[PDB]
Amino acid sequence: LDNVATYAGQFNQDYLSGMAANMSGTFGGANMPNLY
Amino acid sequence: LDNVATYAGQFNQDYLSGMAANMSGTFGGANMPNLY
Amino acid sequence: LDNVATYAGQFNQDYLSGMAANMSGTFGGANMPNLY
Amino acid sequence: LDNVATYAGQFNQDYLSGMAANMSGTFGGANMPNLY
Amino acid sequence: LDNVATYAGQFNQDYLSGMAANMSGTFGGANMPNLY
Amino acid sequence: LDNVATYAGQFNQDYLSGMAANMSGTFGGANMPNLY
Amino acid sequence: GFGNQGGFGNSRGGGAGLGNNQGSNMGGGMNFGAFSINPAMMAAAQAALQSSWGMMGMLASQQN
Amino acid sequence: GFGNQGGFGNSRGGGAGLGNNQGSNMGGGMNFGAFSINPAMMAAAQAALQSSWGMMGMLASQQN
Amino acid sequence: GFGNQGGFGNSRGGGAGLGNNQGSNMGGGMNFGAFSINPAMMAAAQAALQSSWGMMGMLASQQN
Amino acid sequence: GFGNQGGFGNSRGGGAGLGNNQGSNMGGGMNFGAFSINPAMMAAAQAALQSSWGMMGMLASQQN
Amino acid sequence: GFGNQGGFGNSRGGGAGLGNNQGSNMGGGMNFGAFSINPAMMAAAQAALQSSWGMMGMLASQQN
Amino acid sequence: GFGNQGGFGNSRGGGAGLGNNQGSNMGGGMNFGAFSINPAMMAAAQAALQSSWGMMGMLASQQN
């Protein structure tokens, strides 16, 4: 078993008049660039 | 088994007059650029 | 088994007069650009 | 088994006089650009 | 088995006098541009 | 078993008029650049 | 409003060959507006390929 | 508003060959606006490939 | 507003060959605006490849 | 506002060959704005490859 | 605002071959703005490879 | 503001071959702005490889 995960939970933001960014990102591994 | 996941839950945002971004992104792995 | 998933749940946004973006995106992996 | 999925549930938005965007997007993987 | 899916459920929007966009999009994978 | 994970939980941000960034990122390992 | 003209001698999207020519003129430059989705390529190759998919957005204006 | 013209002798997206020519003129430069998605390539290769996918955003203006 | 022109003799996205030519002119330079996503490549190779995916953002303006 | 022109004889994204030419002119330079995502490569190789993925951001302006 | 031009004879992203030429001119230099993500390579190799992934940020301006 | 031009005869991202040429000119130099992420390589090798991943930051300006 091999696992990569992001858990993000519950944003409470009533009467918002400014700016807000709520951002979640998950990226997999084992990448391989080859120059021969 | 191999797993990549994003969990994002419950935004409470009544009477909104500003700007808000609620963003979720999941990206798979094992990518391989090759230059011979 | 191999799995990529986004879960996004329940937006409460009554009497909205501003701007709101509710955005969910899921992208698959194992991509391979080749230059010979 | 191989799976990519977006789940988005329940928008409550009565008496809306502003602007709102409710957006869900799912994109498949294993794409391969080749330059020989 | 291989699966891509978007689930979007229940919009409650009575007495609407502003602007609203309720948008759902699902896109398949395994695409391949080739330049020889 | 091999595991990489980010857990981020509960943002309370009512009456927001400034700028806020809530960001979570998870990146897989075992990457290998080769120059022969 | 949007995209109106007044004044004297103003121009949009002009044709080739406004000067003095004894060779070849082809095409021109490009100008784009705000609030838009536009992936772009400028290329002097021997072979060229552009490929794009899956674009979503509201793209809206309210002025009540 | 958006993208209007006034004054004297102003121009947008001009054609090739405005000077004096005894050879070849092709194309021109590029100008882009704010609040936009635009991945870009400028190349003098023998072979060139651009490939792009999966772009999302609101792209909106409110002026009530 | 956004992207308007006034004054005298101003230009956007100009065509090639504005000088004196007895050879080859191809293309031109590039200018980009604020609040944007634009990965970029400038290359004099024998072979060239650009590949990009998965781009998200709000991209919005409020002026009430 | 964003990206407007006035004054006399100003230019954006110019075409090649503005001087005196008896050889080859190709392309030009590049200029980028604030608040942006733009990985970049300048190369004089025999073979060249650029590969980029997974880019996210708000990219927004408020001026109420 | 952002990226406007005035005055006399100013330029952005210029084309090659502004002098006197009996050989080869290719490309030009590069200029980048503030608040940005831009990994960079300048190379005179026989073979060259650039590879980049996983970039996140807010990238925003407030001027109320 | 950000990245504007005035005065007389100023330039950004210039093209190759502004002098007198009977050989080869390729490329130019590079200039970068503040508040940025930019790993860099300058190489005269026979073979060259650059590889970079996992970059995060806010990248923001407030001027209320």
Curated annotation (Swiss-Prot), chains A, B, C, D, E, F:
Location(s) in or outside the cell: Cytoplasm; Melanosome; Nucleus envelope; Nucleus, Nucleoplasm
Q: Which domain of life does the UniProt lineage start with?
A: Eukaryota
Q: Which cysteines are joined by disulfide bonds?
A: none
In the record's own words, the domains note is: A pair of annexin repeats may form one binding site for calcium and phospholipid.
Chain's role: Binds specifically to calcyclin in a calcium-dependent manner. Required for midbody formation and completion of the terminal phase of cytokinesis.
Associated disorder is: Amyotrophic lateral sclerosis 23: A form of amyotrophic lateral sclerosis, a neurodegenerative disorder affecting upper motor neurons in the brain and lower motor neurons in the brain stem and spinal cord, resulting in fatal paralysis. Sensory abnormalities are absent. The pathologic hallmarks of the disease include pallor of the corticospinal tract due to loss of motor neurons, presence of ubiquitin-positive inclusions within surviving motor neurons, and deposition of pathologic aggregates. Inclusion body myopathy and brain white matter abnormalities: An autosomal dominant, adult-onset disorder characterized predominantly by proximal limb girdle muscle weakness affecting the lower and upper limbs and resulting in gait difficulties and scapular winging. Additional features may include dysarthria, dysphagia, low back pain, and hyporeflexia. Muscle biopsy shows fiber type variation, internal nuclei, rimmed vacuoles, and cytoplasmic protein aggregates or inclusions. Cognitive impairment or frontotemporal dementia occurs in some patients.
What does the subunit section of this Swiss-Prot or TrEMBL entry state?
Answer: Interacts with S100A6. Interacts with PDCD6 in a calcium-dependent manner. Interacts with KIF23 during cytokinesis.
Entry's family note: Belongs to the annexin family.
What is the recorded name of this protein?
Answer: Annexin A11
Per the UniProt entry, what species is this protein from, by scientific name? Homo sapiens
- Quote the range of the complete protein represented: 39 to 74 of 505
Curated annotation (Swiss-Prot), chains G, H, I, J, K, L:
**Residue ranges with Gly residues bias:** 1-22
Residues spanning the signal sequence:
none
Give the sites modified to Phosphoserine. S11
- Protein localization: Nucleus; Cytoplasm; Cytoplasm, Stress granule; Mitochondrion
What effect on the protein does mutating G6S have, as reported in its record? Answer: In ALS10; loss of ability to negatively regulate the expression of CDK6
Please describe, based on the UniProt annotation, the reported consequence of changing G14S: In ALS10; also in patients with frontotemporal lobar degeneration with motor neuron disease
UniProt PTM comment: Hyperphosphorylated in hippocampus, neocortex, and spinal cord from individuals affected with ALS and FTLDU. Phosphorylated upon cellular stress.
Q: In the UniProt annotation, what is the result of changing M56V?
A: In ALS10; impedes the development of normal limb and tail buds and increases the number of apoptotic nuclei when expressed in chick embryos; loss of ability to negatively regulate the expression of CDK6
What is the disease in the record?
Amyotrophic lateral sclerosis 10: A neurodegenerative disorder affecting upper motor neurons in the brain and lower motor neurons in the brain stem and spinal cord, resulting in fatal paralysis. Sensory abnormalities are absent. The pathologic hallmarks of the disease include pallor of the corticospinal tract due to loss of motor neurons, presence of ubiquitin-positive inclusions within surviving motor neurons, and deposition of pathologic aggregates. The etiology of amyotrophic lateral sclerosis is likely to be multifactorial, involving both genetic and environmental factors.
Q: What does the record say about domains?
A: Consists of an N-terminal domain (NTD) and two tandem RNA recognition motifs, RRM1 and RRM2, followed by a C-terminal glycine-rich region.
Instruction: Return the protein name.
Output: TAR DNA-binding protein 43
* Species per Swiss-Prot/TrEMBL record: Homo sapiens (Human)
Q: Which residues of the full protein are shown?
A: 282 to 345 of 414
